[PDB]
Write a protein that binds this DNA or RNA. Structure first.
Ligand SMILES: COc1cc([C@@H]2c3cc4c(cc3[C@@H](O[C@@H]3O[C@@H]5CO[C@@H](C)O[C@H]5[C@H](O)[C@H]3O)[C@H]3COC(=O)[C@H]23)OCO4)cc(OC)c1O
Ligand SMILES: COc1cc([C@@H]2c3cc4c(cc3[C@@H](O[C@@H]3O[C@@H]5CO[C@@H](C)O[C@H]5[C@H](O)[C@H]3O)[C@H]3COC(=O)[C@H]23)OCO4)cc(OC)c1O
Ligand SMILES: [Mg+2]
Ligand SMILES: [Mg+2]
Lengths: 778, 778
DNA sequence: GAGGTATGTAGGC
DNA sequence: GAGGTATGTAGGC
DNA sequence: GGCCGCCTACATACCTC
DNA sequence: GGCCGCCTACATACCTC
């Protein structure tokens, strides 16, 4: 068994006194090695005797979905392990280490005494990924096979502090375990004075003195799992079985533990399995749902919106090419991505990919390097080390305006601003892209719609001159859906058809009877075009009718020749019995693809939402964009009023500076006093010149007060009359813009509808420019 | 054979038309895959037929040092391959692919026809590492075993452009191959207008259109190696044999190719092996010498000083902990490290390590995490992802002053400033650290001296009040070396002894005759203390006298018990015959270590230098520090005079601003004209407030001219009388400092000697503070 | 007297 | 009517 | 996310005649 | 510096009675 340092005096007569430390990873392995190799000067703490160490190798395989429970009709319920379940390395290694067998029920004391270890202790990072997923899977495995071990306290975990607050002059921390508990303590505290807060997002984050202090009290922080009667149904719901049983379980939200329950947990270290599944596992499931399911407003997940915000910040100053690993490091540093860089780099590569049938029809990045062709389905991309990306600055700036970004709700990580909670683009991305992802109860599949039907719908909704504007609003009222929405034909030489309530994409083929070669030039929408030939070479009877398959397709195009038997050409027609929707050759070559859509997204609040059609998603996305435009115009009006009054005061001071002559006043106090005496308005120029994320009410409440720094901070060069004339012209331009904004707020359909129209035209032009340049705008 | 995609139609009757593409890495593999899978629309270019692909897996093993050439006395010179040479994976894979046997000499045409490929083509990055090292090793292998293959043009390479300059409106580049050629072309060019310069520091840097254009002319850029009569001695010198034979070969410098030779190379693609060894291999050897051998001024290699400069820039704003991989990415991005991050992260970890016997006695970083203990010799450090570092801000700022860093010579990469060419600290790091590195002809071994003898020497050199000042200067004159230099005793409980001309470090042991257990508590200076017990468990007779060895040592301390045979205690004394320098037990347990020093460093110019003693290194380091102090004081004097005159002009304008009243002047032109009329001095305040990297002559030549921006850029708040009084006091302080500087330049030993003394005291205090806090200054 | 074997360091492929 | 087998996507371990 | 072949020198061990 | 086991759902194939 690899990554297993055997504990001495284990497996013998003293085996009942030995514990096995199951680590979720190698960082936990290193922490355990340090703690157990403390050795001398720490006799109370454990050493490698009576303490074995084993790694779980990340998450483990869910055995609830592997067991079959067949042939229980013989009077006994026998459970048969899957061959994939039998051949797993980590589970069989754990079974070998413990010396346990599946056939035996560990009822009496002797059966447990047969074990090679007294108990198994799990050490995982104090986070959702590991405390609720890895530990949850391990607990489910043990409950599924040997419930008596959990009942008799064979399974336990070592609990580590997530957050430590140190008060100055005191060496003991508060070691809080959950974010909610720490927040409650902080709000209970009068102030955070002389308090240093440290977050341990992983076991390896602990320091040498910290791990020494932990292992000094290693007899503590060890909690035994207990099995209740209600735990069976919870284990069945969360792991294994039908997905729907957990769907209705994951649409509610995590119920926090009562104070009495937490007090019982900490007083005596006996964690019920039901409570663990209710809290930690459910929290992990909800987080994974919010992490792997896109938000319908921006059509992109937390990872991809985080990447987009990081790219916007990184490439704003200069659009120079950046290596994928460097950009991922920048995103993790600035956007507070605390998971890793393998998945982040993979997500960046996927976001920057662009080929026929790729997931992203309008990528947010332009990629320099080899990002993979349609033939490998994006799997042939090069390493992130030697691959560069750039921000599609014009497409993003026309699709995600910065002024909109200023007014979006934002996610705050540890009190610091991070990527926005959601973006509200001028056009719905959730309808314009492809995707097929499972996530802990819900599957997400989306097929992109044409960028002619969506444009028509949005323009008819916004433009009052559109003849279908009133009809479209009535459709919004009563869900008529008068205008059509159709799958995108871009980069697809086949043809889409609709039968019943389903769409099918067909590849095209050429038959040369005299040459007896079948030429296929376009395959279904998202087939990898290389796994396709493997599928057609593995169909037993399909391969019998043919002799050779050669792939002459270059990049971006498909051209495959099939040499078949001379007498089979008619026989195939007799073999497959073509229907009205697919031909005999299409049936033979699997050229038809039924496209299914699972329109499951996450709400802006954080829940799950399911749409029956793409019209519903569009109708849900419309009001958010309307309200964003309206509030953006209102904020622009307010800030422009403030800027006009500030600039008028500035010009007045520039005019009167000769008369005032503040060169003979003591300091800023006297100068501010005399400026207030002369009637100059007090206002904080920092907020006026840059409101940033300032709402209307706070903008007003902060601009009503302030200092006279605007007057004091202006340089001598601004006193020249040319600068004053430029300032006056700027005031005229700003007041004209203010009048235009006031006109915009009174527009007939809704405020800012015309601005939405020009934005739509600009983003359409940018998208066309991208399409006709292979998404290489240079 | 792994990483080998067999070419079709190879190994048969058409094998003579097939070529094998030997790639130094997987990025080259990806480039070759793209080029060969271009396929359609590129019929002239090659495809996977007639073109095999194989990876070299980085550098290969040098077979010149593995062959033995034994038993040639039988009338024939038979060469015997080493078992390590036989068992190498990559070389045997290449041999299998080609179908080459070692016994046969490929004289006639039939023997070459027996080969499975027509020729072997090497593709490597156009840089010193790969074109001169990997290709050089491959050429040496082929020349050593089958010279007739090189003679008959079996070995060839594909050459790629290092630098491409594109002129606007023209699609063809200039594709320059060497830095010298590109520099000559650029200086020949009148100006760099409408020219875009792209550097390809690796094959994967090429773009899709670029690789398509390259493979369109793939019949070109293929150069066959030719063997000359003079190539045998060159191959022997550069690879294999004695090191000294190349020592005198690497102390000269690379001789550039003549224009006629380069014209012959590019006319007919026939590269002589002698020219390749003379240019590319020698350049690689010189670069590796400069890369792996520290500079005696700062005692750190190019990578290490690059890391130091990157850390100084990164942690200057905030000393917050940074992950090792993040810091390595920052260093690579800002200091232009174009090799990787594996070696960079390893170097960062080694630089931040601190334990008894570690290489760095005074690390430049304080490490948060597990950097490894003395037991594994630093090999037990954790992964760079979960390990943090901080800059030892006070130690660095007292040891590498910033004002010194302003005046150092700097390395410019592609016209952009990078880490300094060398640091010259207040105390010689080359004398105060450990190290043992081979580098292409020279070995570097250094044992740190005590930080009491070095301090005494430097203080006696600098302080004129020291009673040995004149004696030390006379010693400098005639190399007496009156004062002693001894190895450091810190973190070493043993004792150093000197015999003849060599120093020996001894571990200490305690003998308990009644207990019959030998307890060793301190081992030699740099033994890993775990490989030590492996060495003592592998000595056949040394293990016979003993029964058990147990390691009770914790971190930072050594405590090992040896249980030996009851009657062996006296027999060991009879077995080993103790000498006057080592005892019988010390001989038995290998507790004596002779410390050897190979004082080989790199000159600031770029050569190699060898010192016979540490006194020579100290005497070489002293004048550089003296001159830096003198020039720093000169620059301070000049810039302080400039700041005095600028501030006096500023105060005069602030006083007269009421009378001037520039508020009625049209623009900056008239304002500057009237200021010049009033007698205000013109000078560029940007250089005055921050000369940054500016010499005396350029500082003067730029300060004599300038604009009046200093007057125009000052804010209104500065016109208050308190600001004017503060400015006047600042002028008084700066003039007093100027007088003190003028006094400093007239100091008796040399200018700035006293400043050197205070610097020495400050760095000694900071070092002591680190020493007594386990290098954890917090 | 016998050497050729294996190790080991930092900066790189 | 027979189900259990294998695959496959993106974000994570 | 760990792990593994190589170069370069030079000294020091062991091993075998 | 590449490469490899897992979770999550769901539809669609094949395979076998
Ligand atoms: C060895 O050390 C540990 C490894 C792991 C697993 C892991 C486990 C594996 C395994 C591979 C991996 C690997 O995943 C790979 O990442 C790749 C990243 O690029 C993308 C393109 O492709 C991904 C592979 O699809 C995936 O397989 C690790 C990445 O980060 C992890 O957490 C993964 O192959 C065999 O078992 C967990 C640990 O404890 C927490 C460890 O200590
Ligand atoms: C697989 O892909 C390639 C690999 C390579 C080699 C390499 C080769 C190896 C091998 C390992 C390695 C590995 O070195 C390892 O790095 C580690 C980095 O952390 C430090 C602590 O420890 C280092 C190991 O001491 C070293 O062994 C690569 C790192 O960068 C390289 O260049 C190395 O084990 C077997 O053969 C070259 C290529 O073409 C250019 C490749 O395509
Ligand atoms: Mg985690
Ligand atoms: Mg290179």
């Amino acid at each position: 068994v690899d990554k297993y340092t055997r504990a001495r005096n284990a497996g013998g007569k003293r085996a009942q006194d030995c514990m096995l430390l199951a680590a979720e990873g190698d960082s936990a392995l290193s922490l355990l090695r340090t703690g157990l190799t403390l050795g001398k000067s720490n006799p109370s703490g454990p050493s490698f005797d009576f303490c074995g160490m084993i790694s779980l190798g990340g998450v483990i395989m869910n055995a609830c979905k592997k067991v079959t429970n067949i042939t229980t009709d013989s009077g006994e319920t026998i459970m048969v392990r899957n061959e994939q379940l039998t051949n797993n390395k980590v589970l069989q290694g754990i079974v070998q280490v413990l010396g346990l067998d599946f056939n035996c029920h560990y009822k009496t004391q002797e059966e447990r005494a047969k074990l090679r270890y007294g108990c198994i202790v799990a050490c995982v990072d104090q986070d959702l990924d590991g405390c609720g997923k890895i530990l949850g899977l391990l607990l489910a495995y043990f409950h599924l096979f040997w419930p008596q071990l959990i009942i008799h306290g064979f399974v336990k975990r070592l609990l580590t502090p997530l957050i430590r607050v140190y008060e100055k002059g005191k060496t003991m921390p508060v070691e809080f375990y959950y974010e909610q508990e720490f927040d409650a303590w902080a709000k209970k505290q009068t102030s955070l004075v002389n308090h240093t807060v440290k977050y341990y997002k992983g076991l390896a984050a602990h320091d040498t003195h910290e791990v020494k202090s932990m292992f000094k009290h290693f007899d503590n922080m060890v909690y035994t799992f207990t099995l209740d009667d209600s735990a069976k149904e919870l284990f069945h719901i969360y792991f294994g079985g039908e997905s729907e049983l957990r769907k209705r379980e994951l649409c509610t939200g995590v119920v926090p533990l009562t104070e009495t329950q937490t007090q019982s947990i900490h007083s005596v270290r006996r964690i019920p399995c039901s409570l663990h599944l209710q809290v930690d596992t459910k929290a992990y499931k909800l987080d994974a749902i919010e992490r792997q399911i896109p938000n319908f407003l921006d059509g992109m997940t937390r990872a991809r919106r985080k990447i987009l915000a990081g790219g916007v910040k990184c490439f704003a100053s200069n659009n120079r090419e950046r290596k994928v690993f460097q950009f991922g490091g920048y995103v993790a540093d600035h956007m507070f991505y605390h998971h890793g860089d393998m998945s982040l780099n993979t997500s960046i590569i996927k976001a920057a990919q662009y080929y026929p049938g790729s997931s992203h029809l309008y990528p947010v990045f332009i990629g320099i390097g080899s990002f993979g062709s349609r033939h490998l389905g994006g799997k042939d991309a090069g390493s992130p080390r030697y691959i560069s990306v750039q921000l599609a600055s014009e497409f993003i700036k026309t699709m995600f305006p910065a002024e909109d970004s200023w007014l979006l709700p934002y996610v705050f990580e540890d009190g610091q601003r991070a990527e926005p909670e959601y973006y509200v683009p001028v056009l719905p991305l959730a309808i314009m892209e492809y995707g097929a992802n499972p996530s802990e109860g819900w599957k997400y599949t989306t097929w992109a719609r044409q960028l002619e039907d969506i444009l028509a719908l949005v323009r008819a909704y916004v433009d009052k001159d559109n003849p279908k504007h009133e009809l479209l609003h009535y459709a919004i009222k009563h869900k008529i859906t008068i205008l059509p929405l159709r799958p995108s034909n871009y980069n697809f030489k086949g043809h889409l058809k609709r039968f019943g309530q389903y769409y099918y994409s067909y590849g095209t083929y050429d038959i040369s009877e005299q040459r007896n070669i079948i030429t296929i030039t376009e395959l279904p929408l998202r087939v990898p075009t290389v796994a396709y030939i493997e599928s057609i070479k593995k169909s037993s009877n399909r391969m019998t009718f043919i002799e050779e398959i050669i792939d002459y397709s270059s990049s971006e195009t498909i051209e495959i020749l099939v040499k078949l038997k001379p007498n089979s050409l008619n026989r195939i027609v007799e073999e497959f019995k073509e229907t009205e929707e697919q031909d005999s050759i299409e049936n033979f070559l699997r050229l038809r693809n039924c496209l299914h859509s699972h329109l499951n997204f996450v709400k802006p609040k954080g829940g799950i939402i399911e749409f029956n059609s793409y019209y519903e998603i569009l109708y849900a996305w419309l009001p958010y964009r309307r309200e964003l435009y309206q509030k953006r115009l209102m904020r622009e009006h307010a800030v422009l009023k403030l800027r006009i009054i500030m600039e008028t005061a500035i010009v007045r001071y520039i005019n009167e500076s000769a008369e005032l002559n503040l060169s003979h006043y003591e300091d800023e106090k006297e100068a501010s006093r005399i400026l207030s005496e002369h009637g100059f308005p007090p206002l904080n120029h920092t907020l006026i010149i840059s409101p940033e994320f300032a709402s209307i009410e706070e903008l007003n409440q902060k601009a009503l007060q302030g200092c006279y720094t605007y007057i004091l901070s202006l340089q001598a060069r601004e006193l020249l009359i040319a600068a004053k004339t430029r300032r006056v012209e700027k005031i005229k331009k700003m007041q004209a813009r203010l009048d235009k904004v006031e006109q915009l707020l009174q527009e007939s359909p809704f405020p800012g509808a015309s601005v939405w129209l020009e934005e739509i035209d600009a983003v359409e032009k940018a998208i066309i420019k991208g399409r006709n340049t292979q998404w290489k705008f240079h």
